[PDB]
């Protein structure tokens, strides 16, 4: 069978086994927290240029395209994450704009692979634009040729606020979600104020949010989990007693906390009927739910319906003991972070992002500056260089005489030599001079941004406010003590 | 009314006859086959690349024109692959085409073909405005009504017409014999029919036969009417047991072996010579082994004359020998094919000369502007520095020297690489070369015999490239 | 598909041209093995085409014809089939019958819509 005798290669293959199973499935990353397959989806959708501006497209074709541009990995988790980042209700924020059959929230994952027709959302335009942006190393695949980026850089801790699902690999962890607006607020307060305290930002930060809209009670678990990320908290559904025209009372729920089925709990209600461990209950009904979710339990008189609500949030799954585990990974090794340290690593990432983008733009401007330096030096002593080309013979003689007379490089000399008559009007000569000084002003501006670091902070805050303007984030949940 | 009905009769009869009856004198190439070769040249894919297996070619053909069947277009393809019927050669192909056997190759697109070697030089000079064009009914692409030629294929491949008024037999001939006939009529406008007997000893076949007559050939090349003998080859050899064995290789043309053999079996089996149960007619993939053995107490020659009376081993092959030119049919003789091909090639060469003068004098005008630019430069530079517009620069150049608009703008098309003096001498050298070639073409245009010499040049080109002998062994 | 019923709207949906035939060609012609009709050859003169349509049936006598504007005009007006079979079989078993006694067998020239016919002098002229 095995007959493998060398324990050393067993240990080495076992370390690669463990770390590769880590790297494969979902991890608390530095910059996106995502699966690498998510990164694959995003980078393929970007570099194919499939915008939401353009119309819809059959997406299983795109799935096979990305699968063929990448490794021959299995289709299952691919199509799974394809659905998951198109599910509007599960992830708090919108990524993939599907068009087909999914199942709403009640245990029917419709998997119509033929009908896989979709687009994306407009938030990847805020997520990543690294076309020219020297940011991230690449790994090569098909006989080691074609790029794949290591990480997903951004200007945005959105995926902090999204939430994570990486549990069964080694030890368990997740990321519970918040909303974005007060996140922007507390972040900018740390930006302009690098020496703030936790609880004063808890004054800025409400509870961990949920897309359905949850009733939150208690803050001791909030105190523990904003610090150390461990603990379960209690969650209740928006549930009311309503009187009829007859005086009969009605238990009316609006939503539920996270990871709840209507139908499994409904079967559990029918159990509780036939289990004969709860009384009073008459009608278990649910209709018209697509204009708005409306599930109604209706109970006879002389029953103490609020005590029955107490019995619901004691024994039924309507009560939620929602636990946290945010056990981080920063450059491979597992860690654990406070809410400050997350944003700190975000800050220094934005530092490196804007610095490297500015240096790429710097080298753009420097190269074009040397171009226009050569142009203006050609404009200096024109007829002498006319005599030069009327005299000399070769590339070597021309470059030697131009370097002796004007101290320029070879490419500069040849770009001089590539000047035609139709770029010899004094109009375009002074337009060269004008755009030359324009780029000089841009170089000086970027050097001034290199002088002081806080301009980066200010521009980040500006475009955070732009995103919060285009993406107003009202609340949906409710916190109590 | 009835005059308009007569107009419809005349015009529609012209449509049908020019459609599917005899082609022009100028090409000898039927317009179906003409468009086959034109679209296969406009495939562009060389015969050097391996020849294709597709009906996409014929789909573009049917997009070019709607017939009463593209299966007939494929029939035209296959009948131009019939080397055993139509001579050398118009198809570079691979697929099933059979022989003169009764073969049915239903695999239509599954055959391979592309351009052929003779077609390559046969249809050059499209890029020289030599031949006129007409638009299709589809109003999108054009087509030529005639073709340029490098030989009278009229004589190379014959004609087997249909009787719309009457059909037409035209026999094939030989390559180099036709070349010698061209040279003969070129050197002498005073040739005779015996001269034609010299440079053409006789019409030949891709298979071979025997033509015993002489004056039928004489009336064929003079009157255009007459019938000949087509005879099978006969070889009388000795069986080891004493039988006058008959070996046959050649045959009359358009004569399958199969039904002839069946009628021979019938004539045996109708109370006649029945002891000839010896018909060894096989192994014909090396050649033709059509061997019988005459029975004992019977001579071979009587059975030979009886099968000549069966009109299949000796056949009166007639000739109608008609043609189409200037919208009319015509009874044929030589100095008509001959002078027609001569003056057609005159048209082609002279119009090619005119087009080459067009290109050469245009480029000469360019290099005029180039050398006049390279005379004096820096003053033009400094006056350009006193300007800000290419229209102003054009007006400045018109004030400076005599140029064209194209010349002025091409002088504007000068980077700093253009500012040397060696390339001045190079442009001057090619300028004098081009002036010398223009004067050469003008002197050739003031030379009638030089055209004939160019015709001799192309004849010697195709003669060094190819030749063919008389495979059809003819005794008279 | 789409045709238009009888009121001047010839629907010509060439894309929608989806069809079958009727079961009467099984009575019309079965010449597979049947040495009946010469053939003419087309694409470089190879493939068959029959000269005529033989049958066992004068059905197309009873159908009707439309050949008018070519030279002079002619048609074939239709009958029905049953009394046609009757009068034909009477001529078969009786080769020396008269016209009007078969007009006793043959009603007027028929029409598919169902027409009111008056008069028989034109019937006398046109059957002759």
Q: What is the SS3 string spanning chain A?
A: CCCCCCHHHHHHHHHHHHHHHHHHCCCCCCCCCCCHHHHHHHHHHHHCCCCCCCCCEEHHHHHHHHHHHCCCCCHHHHHHHHHHCCCCCCCCCCCEEECCCCCCCCCCCCCCCCCCEEEECCCHHHHCCCCCCCCCCECCCCCCCCCCECCCCCCCCHHHHHCECCCCCCCCCCECCCCCHHHHHHHHHHHHCCCCCHHHHHCCCCCCCCCCCCEEECCHHHHHHHHHCCEEEEEECCEEEEECCCCCEEEEECCCCCCCCHHHHHHHHHHHHHCCCCCCEEEEEECCCCCCCCEEEEECCCCCHHHHHHHHHHHCCCCEEEEECCCCEECCEECCCCHHHHHHHHHHHHHHHHHHHHHHHHHHHHHHHHHHHHHHHHHHCHHHHHHHHHHCCCHHHHHHHHHHHHCCCHHHHHHHHCCCHHHCCHHHHHHHHHHHHHHHHHHHHHHHHHHCCHHHHHHHHHHHHHHHHHCCCCCCCEECC
Residue C63 token pair? 């159908």
Counting Cα atoms < 13 Å in the Cβ hemisphere of B424 gives 14
CA–CA gap between residue A29 and residue C25 (Å, rounded): 77
d(CA A150, CA A39): 9
Length of chain C in residues, anyone? 128
How many other CB atoms are there within 10 angstroms of residue A60's CB atom?
A: 17
- Distance CA(A305)–CA(A297), nearest Å, equals 11
Residue with tokens 């007569």: B6
Q: Residue C12 burial by CB count (10 A; 0-12/13-18/19+): exposed, middle or buried?
A: exposed
If 0-12 CB within 10 Å is exposed, 13-18 middle and 19+ buried, where does residue A466 land?
exposed
A346, A157 contact by CB (below 8 A): yes
Q: Round to whole Å and give the CA distance between A299 and A309.
A: 11
- B-chain residue closest to A417, CA distance: B416
Helices (H), chain C: 25-28, 59-63, 82-93, 99-103, 121-127
Residue B375, chain A, CB below 8 Å: the answer is: no
Secondary structure of residue B323 in the 3-state scheme: strand
Residues from chain C that touch B162, judged by Cβ atoms under 8 A, are 45
Angle between helices A181-192 and A454-470 (to 10 degrees): 170
User: Which residue of C40, C41, C42, C44 is the best one to mutate when testing the B interface, meaning the one whose CB has the most B CBs within 10 A?
Assistant: C44
Tokens (6 digits) for B178: 């036709």
* CA distances in angstroms from B339 to B141, B181, B332, C70, C75, listed in the order given: 33, 11, 12, 45, 56
Residue B95 near residue B109 (C-beta atoms within 8 A): no
Q: Do residue B416 and residue A416 have CB atoms under 8 angstroms apart?
A: yes
C-alpha span between B26 and B153 (Å, rounded): 10
User: Please, which residues bridge with residue B279 across strands?
Assistant: B292
Q: Which residue has 């010839």 as its token pair?
A: C10
Say if residues A351 and A456 touch (Cβ distance below 8 Å).
Answer: yes
CB A269 within 8 A of CB A297: yes
How many residues appear in chain A? 481
In which region does residue B28 sit, left (phi positive, over 0), alpha (psi from -120 to 50) or beta (all else)?
left
Of B329, B332, B400, B330, give the one whose Cα is nearest residue B369: B400
CA angle B56, B62, B64 (to 5 degrees): 105
Q: Which residue do the tokens 């056990």 mark?
A: A327
B77, containing H or E segment = helix B71-79
Extended strands (E) in B71-210? 92-93, 113-114, 134-135, 142-143, 159-160, 169-170
Angle at B456 between CA B455 and CA B460, to 5 degrees: 120
Q: Does B415 sit within 8 Å of A386, measured CB to CB?
A: no
Q: Which residues of B touch C42 (CB under 8 A)?
A: 69, 71-72, 75
B412 vs A contacts (CB less than 8 Å): 420-422
In angstroms, the CA B374 to CA B418 distance is 9
User: Which token pair is B38?
Assistant: 């034109």
In degrees, to the nearest 5, what angle opens at C-alpha B450 toward C-alphas B444 and B454? 110
- Is B302:B240 a contact under the CB 8 Å cutoff? no
- Whether residue C47 lies within 8 A of chain B, CB to CB, comes out as yes
| Cβ neighbour number for residue C45 with a 10 Å cutoff | 12
Contact B110, B35 (CB under 8 A): no
State whether residue B385 sits within 8 Å of chain A by CB.
Answer: yes
- Residue B244 parent element (H or E): strand B244-248
Cα B417 to the chain's mean position, in Å?
Answer: 50
Residue with tokens 């069978």: A1
CB A36 within 8 A of CB A22: no
Distance (Å, whole) CA A167 – CA C44: 77
Place of tokens 């753009």: A364
In angstroms, how far is the first alpha carbon of chain C from the final one?
42
Domain limits for position A367:
1-481
C-beta separation of B472 from B161 below 8 A: no
What secondary structure letter does DSSP report for B294? P
Q: Do B416 and A389 touch (CB under 8 A)?
A: yes
Which among B378, B385, B415 is the nearest to A419, CB-wise? Answer: B415
> What is the rounded CA–CA span in Å between residue B465 and residue C6?
71
Measured CA distances, B324 to A289, A334, B286, B329 (Å): 86, 94, 40, 4
Question: What gap in Å lies between CA A57 and CA A39, rounded to an integer?
Answer: 20
Q: How far apart (Å, rounded) are the C-alpha atoms in residues B143 and A238?
A: 81
Reduced DSSP (H G I as helix, E B as strand, rest coil) percent helix, strand, coil of chain C, to 5:
25, 5, 70
How, if at all, do strands A281-286 and A295-299 pair?
antiparallel
CB-based contacts of B87: which residues, under 8 Å, 6+ apart? B156, B157, B172, B205, B206
d(CA B461, CA C7) in angstroms, rounded, equals 72
- Show the tokens assigned to A465: 């406010």
Nearest neighbour of B79 by CB, restricted to C42, C44, C47:
C44
Annotated active-site positions of A, please? 115
Strands of the A231-236 sheet, one edge to the other: A320-324, A231-236, A215-217, A478-479
Distances (CA, A) of C25 to B105, C28, C48, C89: 30, 4, 20, 22
Q: Are C127 and C99 in contact (CB under 8 A)?
A: yes
Please tell me the distance from the alpha carbon of residue A142 to that of residue A164, in angstroms, as a whole number.
30
> Dihedral (C-alpha) C33, C35, C38, C43: value to the nearest 10 degrees?
20
Helix (H, G, I), strand (E, B) or coil at B15: helix
**Cα angle for residues B8, B14, B16 (degrees, 5° grid):** 100
The set of chains that have 3 or more CB pairs under 8 A with C is B
User: B314-319 and B290-293 as β-strands: parallel, antiparallel, unpaired?
Assistant: unpaired
B291 sits in which H/E element: strand B290-293
Angle at B276 between CA B271 and CA B279, to 5 degrees: 125
Nearest to B251 by CA among B229, B271, B220, B270: B229
Residue of chain A with shortest Cα separation from B410: A421
Residue A234 pairs in a beta bridge with A217, A321
What is the rounded distance in angstroms from the CA atom of residue B305 to the CA atom of residue B430?
74
CA B47 to chain C, closest CA, distance in angstroms equals 25
Residue B404: CB atoms within 10 Å: 14
| Contact present, A68 and A90 (Cβ < 8 Å) | no
Of residues B382, B413, B415, nearest to A418 (C-beta): B415
8 Å CB contact between A325 and A340: no
**Which among A332, A362, A374, A368 is positioned nearest to A445, based on CA atoms?**
A362
* Neighbour order of strands in the sheet with A57-58: A57-58, A117-120, A96-98
- Opening angle at CA C8, ends C6 and C9, nearest 5: 95
Contact status of C32 with chain B (Cβ, < 8 Å): no
**Size of chain B in residues:** 476
CB of C44 within 8 Å of a chain B CB? The answer is yes
Phi and psi at residue A97, to the nearest 5°: -100, 90
Q: Which two three-digit tokens encode residue B441?
A: 């073409």
Q: Sign of dihedral through CA atoms A212, A218, A220, A223?
A: positive
What is the Cα–Cα distance from A330 to A344, expressed in whole angstroms?
Answer: 12
Q: How far apart are CA A45 and CA A61, in angstroms?
A: 12
**Sequence-distant (≥ 6) Cβ neighbours of residue A294 within 8 angstroms:** A252, A254, A286, A287, A288
C72: CB partners within 8 A, 6+ apart: none
Alpha-carbon distance of B122 to B175, in angstroms, equals: 13
Catalytic residues of C: 16
Q: In what helix (H) or strand (E) does residue B197 lie, and over which residues does it extend?
A: helix B193-199
**In this structure, how many other beta carbons lie within 10 angstroms of the beta carbon of residue B274?**
10
φ/ψ of A179, rounded to 5, equals -105, -175
Instruction: State yes or no: is B38 an active-site residue.
Output: no
Show the CA angle centred on residue A63, arms to residues A59 and A65, nearest 5°: 110
Residue numbers followed by a gap, chain A, C–N over 2.5 Å: none
CB A72 within 8 A of CB A130: no
- Residue B336 tokens read as 């008509």
> How far, in Å, are A93, B168, C63, C64, C81 from residue C112 at the CA level?
71, 52, 11, 12, 12
Cα(A433)–Cα(B358) distance, rounded to whole angstroms? 46
Burial degree of B15 (CB within 10 A; 0-12, 13-18, 19+): exposed
Technique that determined the structure? cryo-EM
State the smallest CA–CA distance between residue B71 and chain C in angstroms: 6
**Nearest chain C residue (CA) to B73:** C43
Q: b/e map of C51-81 (b: 16 or more CB within 10 Å)? A: eeeeeeeeeeebeeeeeeeeeeeeeeeebee
CA distance A256 to A212: 7
| CB-based contact B78 C44, cutoff 8 Å | yes
Backbone angles phi, psi at B318, to 5 degrees: -80, 175
Note whether C70 contacts B: Cβ–Cβ < 8 A.
no
Cα A124 from Cα A138, distance rounded (Å)? 20
Q: How far is CA B219 from CA A317, B125, B225, B288, C105, in A?
A: 114, 38, 6, 32, 69
Contact call for C47 and B71, based on CB within 8 A: yes
Closest CA to A226 of A135, A339, A307: A339
With an 8 Å Cβ cutoff, is A382 touching chain B? yes
Q: Which of these, B69, B119, B158, B61, lies nearest to C44 by C-alpha position?
A: B69
* Closest chain A CA to residue B418: A389
DSSP character for C39?
B
**Which residue on chain A is closest to B376 by alpha carbon?**
A390
User: What pairing do the DSSP bridges indicate for beta strands B244-248 and B235-238?
Assistant: antiparallel
Please name the residues in contact with A10: beta carbons below 8 A apart, sequence gap of 6 or more: A4
Measured in degrees and rounded to the nearest 5, phi and psi for residue A297 equal: -100, 140
Strand partners, A333: A330
Phi, psi of B137 (to 5 degrees): -70, -20
Q: Whole-angstrom Cα distance, residue A475 to residue A211?
A: 9
**What's the rounded Cα separation, in Å, for the pair A255 and A209?**
14
Strand-pair partners of A233: A322
- Whether C13 contacts C1, CB under 8 Å: yes
- Cα–Cα distance between A308 and B5 in angstroms, integer? 103
| Alpha carbon distance A31, A164 (integer Å) | 13
CA dist., res. C124 & res. B122, Å (int): 72
DSSP 8-state symbol, C110: P
Q: Are A308 and A245 within 8 A, CB to CB?
A: no
How far is A75 from A64, CA to CA, in rounded Å? 9
Q: Please count the structural domains in chain A.
A: 1
Phi, psi torsion values for B238, nearest 5 degrees: -105, 120
* Most B CBs within 10 Å, among C43, C45, C70, C72, to test the B interface: C43
Judge whether B54 is closer than 8 Å to chain C, CB to CB. Answer: no
In chain B, whose CA is at the least distance from the CA of C71?
B5
CA separation for the pair A225, A232 (Å, rounded): 9
Measured in angstroms, the CA of A155 and the nearest CA of chain B are apart by: 46
């Amino acid at each position: 069978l095995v007959n493998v005798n060398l324990t050393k290669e067993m240990k080495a293959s076992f370390i690669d086994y463990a770390m590769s199973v880590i790297v494969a499935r979902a991890l608390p990353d530095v910059r996106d927290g995502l699966k690498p397959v998510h990164r694959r989806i995003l980078y393929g959708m970007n570099e194919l240029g499939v915008t939401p501006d353009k119309p819809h497209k059959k997406s299983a074709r795109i799935t096979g395209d990305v699968m063929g541009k990448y490794h021959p990995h299995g289709d299952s988790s691919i199509y799974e994450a394809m659905v998951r980042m198109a599910q509007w209700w599960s992830y708090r924020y919108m990524l993939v704009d599907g068009h087909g059959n999914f199942g709403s929230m009640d245990g029917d994952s419709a998997a119509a692979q033929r009908y896989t027709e979709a687009r994306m959302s407009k938030i990847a335009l805020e997520m990543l634009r690294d076309i020219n942006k020297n940011t991230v190393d690449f790994v090569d695949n098909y006989d080691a040729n074609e790029r794949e980026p290591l990480v997903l850089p951004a200007r945005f801790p959105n995926l902090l606020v999204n939430g994570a699902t990486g549990i069964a690999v080694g030890m368990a962890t997740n990321i519970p979600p918040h909303n974005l607006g007060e996140t922007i607020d507390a972040v900018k307060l740390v930006m302009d104020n690098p020496e703030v305290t936790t609880k004063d930002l808890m004054e800025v930060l409400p509870g961990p949010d949920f897309p359905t809209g949850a009733l939150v009670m208690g803050k001791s678990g909030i105190h523990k989990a904003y610090e150390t990320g461990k603990g379960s908290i209690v969650l209740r559904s928006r549930t009311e007693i309503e009187t009829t025209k007859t005086g009969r009372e009605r238990i009316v729920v609006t939503e539920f906390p996270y990871m709840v089925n209507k139908t499994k709990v409904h079967e559990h209600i029918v159990r509780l009927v036939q289990e004969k461990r709860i009384e009073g209950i008459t009608a278990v009904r649910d209709e018209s739910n697509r204009e708005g979710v409306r599930f109604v339990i209706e109970v006879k008189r002389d029953a103490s319906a609020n005590v029955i609500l107490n019995n619901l949030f004691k024994m039924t799954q309507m009560q939620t003991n929602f636990g946290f585990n945010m056990l981080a990974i920063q450059n491979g090794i597992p860690k654990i972070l406070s809410l400050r340290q997350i944003l700190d690593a975000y800050i220094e990432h934005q530092k490196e992002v804007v610095v490297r983008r500015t240096r790429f733009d710097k080298e753009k401007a420097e190269a074009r500056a040397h171009i226009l330096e050569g142009l203006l030096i050609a404009l200096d002593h024109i007829d002498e260089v006319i005599r030069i080309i009327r005299a000399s013979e070769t590339d070597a003689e021309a470059q030697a005489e131009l370097m002796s007379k004007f101290k320029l490089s070879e490419r500069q000399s040849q770009a001089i030599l590539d000047m035609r008559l139709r770029r010899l009007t004094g109009l375009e000569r002074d337009k060269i001079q004008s755009e030359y000084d324009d780029l000089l002003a841009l170089i000086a501006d970027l050097a001034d941004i290199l002088a002081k670091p806080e301009r980066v902070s200010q521009i980040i805050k500006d475009e955070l406010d732009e995103v919060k303007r285009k993406f107003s984030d009202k609340r949906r949940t409710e916190l109590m003590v």
